[PDB]
Design a protein around this ligand. Structure first.
Ligand SMILES: Nc1ncnc2c1ncn2[C@@H]1O[C@H](COP(=O)(O)OP(=O)(O)O)[C@@H](O)[C@H]1O
Ligand code: BEF
Ligand SMILES: [Mg+2]
Lengths: 781, 148
């Protein structure tokens, strides 16, 4: 009975204007139509032909196949009155199957952003839907929750006004595993706020113009193609936008985490290094290319898999794009080129291979061509660097033991030099940028997703580690925490255990004191002389061998590994060379040779080198020491989850994996989330304010005297004959049911519109007569 | 309207036109009326305009002589808001009875309820009433527009 919506709006809204067909409604009689198992569909409808007690005979309404099962293998179907509902909390029948369906529909129908209780589901489309634009941005501005359909721009506005309203900083955190969307959703949130709070093509402020070129830079050298992300966010990200007392943007900051540079030296099978490498090798000019010593793509041994092409992307133009981004910011002409040369130099260090002398076992530099070409990029001395990296003029302090390393340790040192001379740079930029994009503040957490391959290095451990941490946070703030306020206030509540806690699987890798954790152990065990990748592993079992979330490697093919029972699954990490990096070993000989290099830029890069290794804190704790900072401020803000869900592992759109999608929902505590939302009173309000607002809706309630905010509020609620089951009364605050407040809000708004219209007109008059008075003055001048 | 004031009325009217056809654009009527010290709602004007369309509004004409009947008619109505009730509604937004609302609470309202005033209207309207904490006392804002 409503408006008509184009093919495009057929991606935001739904198609309801249809015939009151009695077909789907007639069949209602066979209410015996339920859900049931499947190997290819996961679920499917079927009707009970005979309930044989604990086991009922059924036949799927698809292949007329008579597949019978237990009276506990079926599943309650929801009326066709819900097909593709906006807020799944509305479904009268909540099932592992029901929700799967809904998501099935809207996804395959162009709608991804769904709503699940307080949080929101967001299956990956993998397509280019026309639902993001200057237009849609408008359509949602000021638009309430229900006054429009579920969309990323929707959450952005909801969060933003919530902050401005209850004066309480906020946070939007996108969950989900690697490849599901996390990023894009964050970008949309920022894109929206950039214009919806400023002061396609549009004229934003000046910082918003740059605040826009923030991520297109960190994605360059920081993001890279993996076997589950053509452009994977290869590190953690936390953007914090700072609003004024008038909800306007004024500053923005990003806290970069775990820059997996460890791939800069040797990228895996069918993968690439940090995009920027190729953008330069191809985006550079014959001249500039000759100005930094950059050769071909299959020429550098630093580029494994030779050269990999990224679909729908031309690093050739991509370079120009990324270059343009820098400029918008403040990266001067030179300020950019300076960084560029560094990249080519780092790539070069890769060609520096040693010939382990048979005679003395000391590496050799036959053809110095390599080194010669790298020094001129560093600004350091040839001969000097050559000898330093070669013959370390060590300084054990208590002496001056000059030694020499094999070709190996000679290589292992130049490798951990280039690989860290880059990260020395990543953080250079991030703080170069964060300088320009900088009471209230909104937080956008773009962490990394639960990845699990065939070789689970250390990096991949803290990566998934962080995931589990955020996952715990969700469960906590959701089921745990909330319930607490019910108990505290005293409201007639009761606890319900949602079976969602990963504290254990965390301690197994967290707690240092008391039983030590996988990282705790590695930590010191690495400070030891006769310490090895191996030795470590055994220590781990020597104490944790009795942990559920812990499990003894099945295959010890030749090396040593172990797997953990994460929330997202199990992963067989290979402890090899773990302690080897937990300490960050490195030839400080050349290090201080750089510290005093002619290349100011590279000089400024390593200018503060009083932490290098020549023999403080372990990577592990250095991390959990900052990844602890995070969760400290988060718990101090208001969480806003954007549960991005990957659709399929084929990297193909239009395809939606059944179970995969189904399990993600389970290992994301979706269903349980919706349970609390509709089970409890996900809303509360201190008396004072409640009565302060919703009184105009209840004038003749409270006497004239100043009485108890409790009894006063009680009288109000009683007047509107509120059903004693939507709300729950407490000490000093009310726990209303969902939307039970939206109604009050709308009713109150209605009871003032006119007055607002009347005054609005008065304000217009003032405005009209005022502007016209100023123009009149110009003419006379 | 009086002859002396009616004459001045004409002046103010013709002062509202770029070129000189002596015609007040159909859209360019509201401000003309208001300028004459009238606070007609964004409805009345439309009602008296036969309810033209935005398209025709930008390409319609109105001679001062043609405008005259409309002016008086509009000038003569029945009700007009005031402090008593005006603010009354403004009070309802009071954080906790601060006798003063914020710059957003106000801005948002005045641009999401009824005859929504553009971001500008709201911003430049109160622009200067919001203090350090950015609060705008209504029991004084309304007055600035009314008595003003
Ligand atoms: N809303 C979306 N619209 C279009 N493509 C999307 C969307 N969400 C995800 N994708 C696609 O899937 C890829 C992976 O998404 P991404 O945001 O990088 O995942 P995550 O950060 O969760 O690992 C993207 O590069 C893009 O191709
Ligand atoms: F690969 Be995604 F950024 F988790
Ligand atoms: Mg990402």
């Amino acid at each position: 009975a409503q408006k008509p919506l184009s093919d495009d709006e057929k991606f935001l809204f739904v198609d309801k204007n249809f015939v009151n067909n009695p077909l789907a409604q007639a069949d209602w009689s066979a209410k015996k139509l339920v859900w049931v198992p499947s190997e290819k569909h996961g679920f499917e409808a079927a009707s009970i032909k005979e309930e044989k007690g604990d086991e009922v005979t059924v036949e799927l309404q698809e292949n007329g196949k008579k597949v019978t099962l237990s009276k506990d293998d079926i599943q309650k179907m929801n009326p066709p009155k819900f097909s593709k509902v906006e807020d799944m909390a509305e479904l009268t029948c909540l099932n592992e199957a029901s929700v799967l369906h809904n998501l099935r529909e809207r996804y395959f129908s162009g709608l991804i952003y769904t709503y699940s209780g307080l949080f929101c589901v967001v299956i990956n489309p993998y397509k280019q839907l026309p639902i993001y634009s200057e237009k849609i941005i408008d359509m949602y501005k000021g638009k309430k929750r229900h006054e429009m359909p579920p969309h990323i721009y929707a959450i952005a506005d909801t969060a933003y006004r919530s902050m401005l309203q209850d004066r309480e900083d906020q946070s939007i955190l996108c969950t989900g595993e690697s490849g599901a969307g996390k990023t894009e959703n964050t970008k949309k949130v920022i894109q929206y706020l950039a214009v919806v709070a400023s002061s396609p093509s549009f004229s934003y402020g000046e910082l918003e113009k740059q605040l826009l070129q923030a991520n297109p830079i960190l994605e360059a050298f920081g993001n890279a193609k993996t076997v589950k992300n053509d452009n994977s966010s290869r590190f953690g990200k936390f953007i914090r936008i700072n609003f004024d007392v008038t909800g306007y943007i004024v500053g923005a900051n990003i806290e970069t985490y775990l820059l997996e540079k460890s791939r800069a030296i040797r990228q895996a099978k069918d993968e690439r290094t940090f995009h920027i490498f190729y953008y330069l090798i191809a985006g550079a000019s014959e001249q500039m290319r000759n100005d930094l010593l950059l050769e071909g793509f299959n020429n550098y041994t630093f580029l494994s898999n030779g050269h990999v092409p990224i679909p729908a992307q031309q690093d050739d133009e991509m370079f120009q794009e990324t270059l343009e981004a820098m400029t918008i910011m403040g990266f001067t002409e030179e300020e950019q080129t300076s960084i560029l040369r560094v990249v080519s130099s780092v790539l070069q260090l890769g060609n520096i291979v040693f010939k382990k002398e048979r005679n003395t076992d000391q590496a050799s530099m036959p053809d110095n061509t390599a080194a010669q070409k790298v020094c001129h990029l560093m600004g350091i001395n040839v001969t000097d660097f050559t000898r330093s990296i070669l013959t370390p003029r060590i300084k054990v302090g208590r002496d001056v033991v000059q030694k020499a390393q094999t070709k190996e340790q000679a290589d292992f040192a130049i490798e951990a030099l280039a690989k860290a001379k880059f990260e020395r740079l990543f953080r250079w930029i991030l703080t170069r940028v964060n300088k320009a994009l900088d009471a209230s503040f909104l937080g956008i957490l773009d962490i990394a997703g639960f990845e699990i391959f065939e070789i689970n290095s250390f990096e991949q451990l803290c990566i998934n580690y962080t995931n589990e941490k955020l996952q715990q946070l969700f469960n906590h703030t959701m089921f745990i925490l909330e319930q607490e306020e019910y108990q505290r206030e005293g409201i007639e509540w009761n606890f319900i255990d949602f079976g969602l806690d990963l504290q254990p699987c965390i301690e197994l890798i967290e707690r240092p004191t008391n039983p030590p954790g996988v990282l705790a152990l590695l930590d010191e065990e690495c400070w030891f002389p006769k310490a090895t990748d191996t030795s470590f592993v055994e220590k781990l079992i020597q104490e944790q061998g009795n942990h559920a979330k812990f499990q003894k490697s099945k295959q010890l093919k030749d090396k040593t590994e172990f797997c953990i029972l994460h929330y997202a699954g199990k992963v067989t990490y290979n402890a090899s060379a773990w302690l080897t990096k937990n300490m960050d070993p490195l030839n400080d000989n050349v290090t201080s040779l750089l510290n005093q290099s002619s290349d100011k830029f590279v000089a400024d890069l390593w200018k503060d080198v009083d932490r290098i290794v020549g023999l403080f804190r372990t990577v592990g704790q250095l991390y959990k020491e900052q990844l602890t900072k995070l969760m400290t401020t988060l718990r101090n803000t208001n969480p806003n989850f954007v549960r991005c869900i990957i659709p399929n592992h084929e990297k193909r759109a239009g395809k939606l994996d059944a179970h995969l999608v189904l399990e993600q929902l389970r290992c994301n505590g979706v269903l349980e989330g919706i349970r609390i939302c509709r089970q409890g009173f996900p809303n509360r309000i201190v008396f004072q304010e409640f009565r302060q607002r919703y009184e105009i809706l209840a004038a003749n309630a409270i006497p004239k005297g100043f009485m108890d905010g409790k009894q006063a509020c009680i009288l109000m609620i009683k007047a509107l004959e509120l059903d004693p089951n939507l709300y729950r009364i407490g000490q000093s605050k009310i726990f209303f049911r969902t939307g039970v407040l939206a109604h009050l809000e709308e009713e109150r708004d209605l009871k003032i519109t006119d007055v607002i219209i009347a005054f609005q007109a008065q304000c217009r008059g003032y405005l009209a007569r005022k502007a016209f008075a100023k123009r009149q003055q110009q003419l006379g001048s | 309207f009086s002859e002396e004031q009616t004459a001045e009325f004409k002046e103010a009217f013709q002062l509202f036109d770029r070129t000189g056809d002596g015609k007040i654009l159909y859209s360019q009527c509201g401000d003309v009326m208001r300028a004459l010290g009238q606070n007609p709602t964004n409805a009345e004007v439309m009602k008296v305009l036969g309810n033209p369309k935005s398209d025709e509004m930008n390409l319609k004409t109105l001679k001062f002589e043609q405008f005259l009947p409309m002016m008086q008619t509009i000038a003569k109505n029945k009700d007009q808001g005031c402090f008593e009730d005006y603010v009354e509604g403004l009070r309802v937004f009071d954080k906790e009875g601060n006798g003063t609302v914020m710059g957003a609470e106000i801005r948002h309202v005045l641009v999401t309820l009824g005859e929504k005033m553009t971001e500008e209207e709201v911003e430049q309207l109160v622009a200067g009433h919001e203090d350090s904490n950015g609060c705008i006392n209504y029991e004084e804002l309304v007055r600035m527009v009314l008595s003003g």
